[PDB]
């Protein structure tokens, strides 16, 4: 199973968006993020293995922590049109993922 | 390139009703999702190779097909308005776990 704190949330076309997640089975390596456009499919986007502690593609970066089985990715310059529902999916088993339930952001502007 | 043929499906109780999915550039397996406002993405059954079907996490209640790559049906023989969310079938074939959704098929089981 998979847990993510955020649900739901709204940011100003600025700040840091940050989303976490969690999950328990040791037996996980490997945890990608996918974001789900608003009447669109789920795509992946920035993915992370326990090896490391962090990972950044532009301002979308992932911090793990090891016990305490804590994740979460970090959206900079929170721009409208990053709003999507960001889903945090785990695994190990060489394609198949356990998904996490997702957290719905929208960034308002202006 | 995953592709979901109908959009809009919809069904009465307790009526047979199949959600088939395709796949151009060989994805060897293939998935089977519905998507439920309240827990995500959420998996049922899927397939390894051309001829085989394996439970997901949500089995019972559908049935798997993989009649040849490429094409990957799931059988919901018997309706119910308990399974009226979202499917989305998905596609695959590397470490990484790299899943391509298709678009999605709506469904809406009539009844009550």
């Known amino acids: 199973q998979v847990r993510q704190s955020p649900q739901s949330l709204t940011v100003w076309e600025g700040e840091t968006t940050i989303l976490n997640c969690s999950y328990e089975d040791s037996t996980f390596d490997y945890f990608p993020w996918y974001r789900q456009f608003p009447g669109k499919s789920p795509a992946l986007l920035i993915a992370?293995?326990?090896?490391?502690n962090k990972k950044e593609d532009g301002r979308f970066t992932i911090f793990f922590n090891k016990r305490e089985k804590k994740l979460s990715l970090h959206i900079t310059d929170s721009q409208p049109g990053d709003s999507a529902t960001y889903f945090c999916a785990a695994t190990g088993s060489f394609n198949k993922l356990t998904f996490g339930a997702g957290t719905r952001l929208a960034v308002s502007p202006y | 390139a995953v592709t979901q043929s109908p959009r809009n499906k919809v069904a009465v109780t307790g009526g047979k009703v199949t959600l088939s999915c395709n796949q151009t550039n060989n994805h060897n397996n293939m998935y089977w999702y519905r998507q439920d406002t309240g827990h995500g993405l959420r998996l049922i059954h899927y397939?390894?190779?051309?001829?085989?079907?394996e439970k997901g996490d949500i089995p019972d209640g559908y049935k798997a097909s993989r009649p040849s790559q490429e094409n990957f049906s799931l059988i919901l023989e018997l309706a119910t308005p308990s399974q009226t969310s979202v499917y989305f079938c998905?596609?695959?074939?590397?470490?990484?776990?790299?899943?391509?959704f298709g678009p999605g098929t709506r469904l809406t089981v009539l009844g009550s």
């Open positions: 992370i293995s326990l090896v490391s």
């Open positions: 998905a596609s695959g074939g590397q470490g990484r776990a790299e899943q391509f």
């Open positions: 397939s390894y190779g051309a001829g085989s079907t």
